[PDB]
Amino acid sequence: DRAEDARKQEITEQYLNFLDNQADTFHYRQKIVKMMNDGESRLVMNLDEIREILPERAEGLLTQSVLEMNCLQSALQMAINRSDVQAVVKTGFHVGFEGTFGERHVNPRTLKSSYLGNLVCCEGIVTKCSTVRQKLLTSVHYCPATNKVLEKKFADFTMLDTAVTNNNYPTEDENKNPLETEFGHSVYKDHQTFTIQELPESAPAGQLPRAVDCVADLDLADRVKPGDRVRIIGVFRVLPNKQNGVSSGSFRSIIIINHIQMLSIPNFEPQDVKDVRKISKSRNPFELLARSLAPSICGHEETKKALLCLLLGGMEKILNNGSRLRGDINVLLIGDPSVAKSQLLRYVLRMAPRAITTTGRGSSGVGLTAAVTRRLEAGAMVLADRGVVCIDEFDKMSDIDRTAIHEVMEQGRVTISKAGIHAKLNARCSVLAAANPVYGRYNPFKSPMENIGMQDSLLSRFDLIFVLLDEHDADKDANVAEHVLKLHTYRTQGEADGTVLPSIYEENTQWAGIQDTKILTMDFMRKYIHLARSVQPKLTDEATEYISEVYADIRSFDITKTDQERTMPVTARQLETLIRLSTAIAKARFSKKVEREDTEKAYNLLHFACFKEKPKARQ
Amino acid sequence: TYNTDWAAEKTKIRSFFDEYYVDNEDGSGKAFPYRDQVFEIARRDKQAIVVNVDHIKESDIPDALELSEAITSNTKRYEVLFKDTISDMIQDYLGDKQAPVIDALDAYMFQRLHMDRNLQDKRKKYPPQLLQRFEVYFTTDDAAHETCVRNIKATEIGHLVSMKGVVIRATEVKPCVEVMTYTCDTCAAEVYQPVKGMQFTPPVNCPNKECVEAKANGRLHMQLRGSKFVKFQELKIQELSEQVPVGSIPRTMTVHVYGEMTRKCNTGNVVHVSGVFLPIMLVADTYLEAHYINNLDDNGVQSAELEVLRRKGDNYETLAASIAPEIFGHVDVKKCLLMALVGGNDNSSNGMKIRGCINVLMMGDPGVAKSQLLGYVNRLAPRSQYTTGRGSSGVGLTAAVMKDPVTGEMSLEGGALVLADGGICCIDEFDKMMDHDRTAIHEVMEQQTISIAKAGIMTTL
Amino acid sequence: LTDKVVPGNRVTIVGVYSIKKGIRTPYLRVLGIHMETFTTFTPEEERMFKTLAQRKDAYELIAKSIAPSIYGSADIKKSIACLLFGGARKKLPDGITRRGDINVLLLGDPGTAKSQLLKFVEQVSPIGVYTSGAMVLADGGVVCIDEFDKIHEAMEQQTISIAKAGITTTLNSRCSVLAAANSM
Amino acid sequence: SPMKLANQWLNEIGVSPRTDRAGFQCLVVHGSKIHALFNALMDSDVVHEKTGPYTKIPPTLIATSPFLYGQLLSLTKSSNIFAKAGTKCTEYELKLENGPVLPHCAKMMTQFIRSTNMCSTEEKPVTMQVMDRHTSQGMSDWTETATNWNTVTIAENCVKWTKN
DNA sequence: TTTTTTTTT
């Protein structure tokens, strides 16, 4: 026994010397200082870093994990006591691990009884969750008959500590005086359990997927929900059971978690910040970004400018009396078949964080907004709050479902009042929609409003509407066909001919078709848009005067002069569209002020959207 | 590492009550309002004191910050010390006089203390819940204690917590046991049992020493003239919409309310609550024990800005202009909404009733600020509901029959027009409601009743 | 003796006949099990494949080899060969992918051994299903659909989506489709 | 530096600011500054190993003139004869091991060879080699009186080495 | 089990 005590003293001394080395080469003392300044209570270590300096500790920490981990946490407490900073937290300090596992990287299928008592790392999908509940750890009692204070500690099989005690709640003194609980001094901890299942990409065909149960406490609780793809590090252990003194030999097993990694976004370095400064200081950054958006699709330049404005977004105003004015931008595409509407929707789904895609073919309005299931259930536009919804085949939706969207696209709210449920829900998001015209193909002998075939109250809620036509014209046909075949004959420069798929500027651009002008890399696009989204520009007087004159001119213009025809309704919402597009353009310049240079581009884009010349079949 | 010298803490608390003050508005002197409220309890014009912890924090007293932190960190214990100091202050004010008898428990206590006559004996014979007959509650306003329902976790057990929310469910007031009193058959002695929590177990055999030694086997019979009861109520409170994270649904919590804080809320109200977070007597269930409640729907006093208007008169044009000043024009529409916000008189000649309130229908082309006007009216009115044509059923507007799966019972659940009673209901997108949903409001708009005959229910609302 | 068998297997078992812990249910404690029942190639197989590829009439020979019990239908058999082999699959630097699958439809009278052609393709294909969801189950494979007069997102996007009360998900799978109709 | 300009530019727009190895080397100290190094070697736990085979064992000190607590010690010596292929070339080997080979050792060993006249046929030279000096690289760079060498040829008339 | 109600497909 005394040899065991000497060995535990040696192991704790080794871990303490590693943690509090005089000149710390791994900077865990500075990380402890960061932890105590931030008020956190567990420290993350690299097992690969322990492996270099103390390999006899590191490999023993996998096989004999319980004793080694207890010794390491004791050494952490002594290292904290050597600081001039105070230990505020009433729960102890803890350790989590990362690194290379090798043998002990497993699945729910391959976790079997050979691994019991070892440290393991496992992967899967969360399928259940308990609600967070509080669990007693120590209890403090006051004896009013004697002015003494009594304390008691509690332990459980699910805890890492192997020690066990009576677990009876104390009520009386040894002299049988009654006792009073001190709730402000007793100690509790947050507790949660969940389960993980095999990933569907790894489960063998036909069979059912296998699953494992998990226990998490303290700061690890309230971190996951169903559907999360996770990697989990902990000790695999077994739990006995009893009924009336008779025991079945089949015991249950769990994972007691040390650390959780999420698998399902930005990254920066000062070289990247320098390059963002340079490109922002260049001559026409908005045009460069609009050209660089989606290079493998020919044409569609004005729609690409509109999509860039959608990805940047406008400014919300909340006034002094609580009134709100909308910030988001909404875009609709109608046109002939095979004109890349769905392709652009899928591209925006890749580029935008917090994005959801649906179709009008298989969506109810209840499922699109919110549902009663009694409980209340979120829909797609609620889930995409402060984000983007892409809707395809928007003409195939029913009007009963369409009328449910009218509140969301303007007020940013979903309100329900049905049996037993009365609630608001926030649904602030941007809508991007694609559709085909009424007749399945655009009729040139009828007006654009007749071909679109939707009511004015719905059409007014879109900031921009684009009508896309597939006109037969030998020049355009030749150019489009040449672009498509050039994209199809392409192969990477460092690739052999028989292979199969199972910096700032781009360098190979034959696939893009654009001959000489440069194009930015998509990773740089993601970084630039992420930074430029946070700029908060203000308006100015020249912008205000230009917007106010231009709005009246757009409303008063008469189309019988020019043989054009009107594509949109014009209401007071389009004035706010001008304001939103001006702020979105000013964001790309990293400007703090909106100017005439921004408002002129916004007007040119809106005036392109508003009017269209009559088709050649009618002319 | 604990402090249990209660006398020093009582000295600090009594110094706070003695030395907090506010200057008189005419400058004539100083008011000492907490000891004025103590004397109101002593003369029995009152039943509770509400103490503001921030006044203790910002008082000009030594150890004031330490006292405030100790109150906040172990609030369930400091309530007893506040009650003890107020009891000592009451006896110092009262002297050799007697407080007036007003109820049967007061009559029993005043009669029995002098039957005992005909401080150690008093404190040993009677428990302090029976000797002291008033309530103490705490409040906070500093933003350090502001939290959501979602954030109250294991660190908050036993602490004072403040939050803001919406009331979903509320029970009616019930009598709750606080102290039971039993009397023995044979030896005529009495047993006092204080009750804590939601359960108690009655003792069976008499404990008095003469009865026990004689083995007289006297039973104990409980008596409700000596026993103490208190008003009890239960609520469920939901998160406010601004508190919820992105793309998420609000959570709820159970609240227990006692005494003078009962009947301050009904369903469809928004409240500010201060209370203590506690478990139920190794995994535990929890609730909130309310200390103070404030209706933000409700909250002879007049503001100076109103006094200027009331002296001015001719206010009609300014009142019309002040409704949603971000919206340009529509002066006559704002006047119509101003009249709908006030309404006429109810008439009840010879048994025949006539509706007093005014109904307005707005129509217009798209983009002319109808929804903005309805939102401003919903913020301006005291009790009001907002609905849309698509998001509401004809049962969610009027009232619903609910079948409880736990018990099998049937019950009624009031809809939007029931919750808005005495106020205004705003209905947006009114043309897109179904006909068989729309025809439910025919009785409400003219007779102001809802009448139901379904399953095993037949009522009028 | 664990994880040695899967449902559907035919077995013979040696074991002890036991009663589970005055009436008990029985069970068998197993002492012995006896079972009653691609992607790798040899140089001989590679030389055979290359000999067929070296032949000039290889494409016509494969088209002839499709369903020899059924007369004629030469261009249809050529089309089925194109369906089996498919095109290349591409992903450009902007991330927009280009499909490799090929899809074929058959119309006309309900006879003339259409179902037998579909069953032949089901047998020959490396992965595949025949049927009258089912659309999901053939990543990298071929699905034959009979009686097609009984999805646009599935064909073009290789994905279907849903948003009904309380669910929204997307199911993604890559396959080629051969369809037979009796006649949108 | 441009990184400070970048952080300033981010703060000026209002974007959140939260968005040497040189291998092994030697060192030289002159004059009065040596006393700081003396106190550093006295103090640090960096040089006093608290974990390993040399747990709590202080650093080694070596000298060529007596000092208090110094122990007198000697290197291990051995020797071999090799013969091969019927040639004239029998080879005779001497080894000195198990301690530091201090600079005076090579100087005295040169005199041992030249005194015993092994150079007499200078057409058959004698060679000497000293090993693992790269661990102490730099100790001969500070002056023109020293040299780096690893293998040396001895004759009576001269001593030779490579350019290194 | 059978019966009655309100949301969803």
Ligand SMILES: Nc1ncnc2c1ncn2[C@@H]1O[C@H](COP(=O)(O)OP(=O)(O)NP(=O)(O)O)[C@@H](O)[C@H]1O
């Ligand atoms: N420059 C281009 N212009 C148009 N189409 C192109 C171009 N380059 C490639 N395509 C192809 O044309 C198709 C684009 O149409 P797609 O987006 O799939 O459906 P859609 O445009 O929404 N028509 P629909 O879904 O029937 O209403 C894809 O097969 C693209 O590969």
Ligand SMILES: Nc1ncnc2c1ncn2[C@@H]1O[C@H](COP(=O)(O)OP(=O)(O)NP(=O)(O)O)[C@@H](O)[C@H]1O
């Ligand atoms: N006269 C106005 N003054 C100020 N803002 C206005 C005015 N007219 C329209 N708006 C703006 O127009 C936008 C749409 O307002 P909204 O209340 O939804 O119109 P609406 O009458 O409800 N149209 P609809 O609900 O489709 O029938 C808001 O951003 C308003 O601020």
Ligand SMILES: [Mg+2]
């Ligand atoms: Mg499409």
Ligand SMILES: [Mg+2]
């Ligand atoms: Mg409206």
Ligand SMILES: [Zn+2]
């Ligand atoms: Zn008795």
